[PDB]
Amino acid sequence: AKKVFKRLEKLFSKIQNWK
Secondary structure (H helix, E strand, O other): OOOOHHHHHHHHHHHHHHO
16 A cells, blocks of 8 residues: 555664664
């Protein structure tokens, strides 16, 4: 569907892994 928007939030979590 067009609700990949959720994956976007998961991307933010990736930032925490890099920090």
